[PDB]
């Protein structure tokens, strides 16, 4: 079974530094190269570095080189990604890769990705504000107002409840905070007969909420 | 590095549509080209490499090939799963580099949203800021005017919208639009009201509510 795990994300302020893992499974790093790829929300995927880790040989983009150190440790079956003087156009997700492969240099396996928030703006946690359902089809939901960084998760009845679920991607106010809505669509006369509860989980703050949502 | 120029940056066609998705390399690449499925928030996927091999366990619908410097994938049959940002992938030499995308959309018929408008809570209030809420459900297409009016007059620059991604399965779209108001402000005005105007309905539909009954 393979694997890629990346670790090591977070906010940090600019000029600062950070150091990323990816931890590799089901296969060993020094039959092929690692690379990291980075996305900017809303943007392209850019590569970033390469290190083939037997020899351990690395390449760099252009637009991190001096800065960023990708390096290895083929014991550990783990490629770091070291990130120096941080800028704002730094952040993005980060995922490492691999090629996988003798004379196979596409990327067949990717991890889930690292998000990196280059930011002078402090950690803040969420509240959470139910939507009530005010009376076919009725509507409630839950607002997740003004947290920093990204990103919130959001399930309804420990995710027991999925059909007609619609969490929205979050918009950033020009505060410089997040605000994201979940809502679910029901049957009017369901109201009287179910509770429902927004579960909401802010990990850069810890910070855990569920608001029963009352009609 | 090498430019990989994609196109087109977007498109929609429906279910069972011949799609055709081109990249064209600035240099030579060889037949060291890749293409990458993303879907939002997760990682890309690999459907093709060295230009025109499929990878196991994509579908047969999902195919590539190359004229040159042109590169092209060919999705011979869409599905309403197919929603996604494609990418095409030189790597023939460092940098690898990537095509900007392809935001491939399903075209269907016409639905109109049912709409819904929630009031800011008493606990948001006492921050200093009040939320309220239009709920644009289960519509097609994505394209939607949603104007706030507060007092019957029209509002600008203080909303924001929200949109999930096409539903895996009936291809509708749902939207979020917040308009956001400070409490004092909020305080001074009764009738809140959300007008959405769309294809799919005959003329604008309204929902509003007024402060102080809810």
């Known amino acids: 079974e393979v694997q890629l795990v990346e670790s090591g994300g977070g906010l940090v302020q600019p000029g600062g530094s950070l150091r990323l893992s990816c931890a590799a499974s089901?296969?060993?790093?020094?039959?092929?190269?690692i690379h990291w790829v980075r996305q900017a929300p809303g943007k392209g995927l850019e590569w970033v570095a390469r290190?083939?880790?037997?020899?351990?040989?690395?390449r760099y983009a252009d637009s991190v080189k001096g800065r960023f150190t990708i390096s290895a440790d083929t014991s550990k079956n783990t490629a770091y990604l070291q990130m120096n003087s941080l800028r704002a156009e730094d952040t993005a997700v980060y995922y490492c890769?691999?090629?996988?492969?003798?004379?196979?240099?596409?990327?067949?396996?990717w991890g889930q990705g690292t998000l990196v928030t280059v930011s002078s703006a402090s950690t803040k946690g969420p509240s959470v504000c139910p939507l009530a359902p005010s009376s076919g089809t009725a509507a409630l939901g839950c607002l997740v107002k003004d947290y920093f960084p990204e990103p919130v998760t959001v399930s309804w009845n420990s995710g027991a409840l999925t059909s007609g679920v619609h969490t929205f991607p979050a918009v950033l106010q020009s505060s410089g905070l997040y605000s994201l809505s979940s809502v679910v669509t029901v049957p009017s006369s369901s109201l009287g007969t179910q509770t429902y509860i927004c579960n909401v989980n802010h990990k850069p703050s810890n910070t855990k909420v569920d608001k029963k949502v009352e009609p | 590095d090498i430019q990989m120029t994609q196109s087109p940056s977007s498109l929609s066609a429906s279910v069972g549509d011949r799609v055709t998705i081109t990249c064209r390399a600035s240099?030579?690449?060889?037949?060291?080209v890749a293409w990458y499925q993303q879907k939002p928030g997760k990682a890309p996927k690999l459907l093709i490499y060295?230009?025109?091999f499929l990878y196991s366990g994509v579908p047969s619908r999902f195919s590539g090939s190359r004229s040159g410097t042109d590169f092209t994938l060919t999705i011979s049959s869409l599905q309403p799963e197919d929603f996604a940002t494609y990418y095409c992938?030189?790597?023939?030499?460092?940098?690898?580099?990537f095509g900007q995308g392809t935001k491939v959309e399903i075209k269907r018929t016409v639905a109109a949203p049912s709409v819904f408008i929630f009031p800011p809570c008493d606990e948001q209030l006492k921050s200093g800021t009040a939320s309220v809420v239009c709920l644009l459900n289960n519509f097609y297409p994505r394209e939607a005017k949603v104007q706030w009016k507060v007092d019957n007059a029209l509002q600008s620059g203080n909303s924001q919208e929200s949109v999930t991604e096409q539903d895996s399965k009936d291809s509708t779209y749902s939207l979020s639009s917040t308009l956001t108001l400070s409490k004092a402000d909020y305080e001074k005005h009764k009738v809140y009201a959300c007008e959405v105007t769309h294809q799919g309905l005959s003329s604008p539909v309204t929902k509003s509510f007024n402060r102080g009954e809810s």
């Open positions: 890769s691999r090629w996988g492969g003798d004379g196979f240099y596409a990327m067949d396996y």
């Open positions: 089901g296969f060993n790093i020094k039959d092929t190269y």
């Open positions: 290190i083939y880790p037997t020899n351990g040989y690395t």
């Open positions: 240099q030579d690449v060889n037949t060291a």
């Open positions: 060295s230009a025109s």
């Open positions: 992938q030189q790597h023939y030499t460092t940098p690898p580099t």
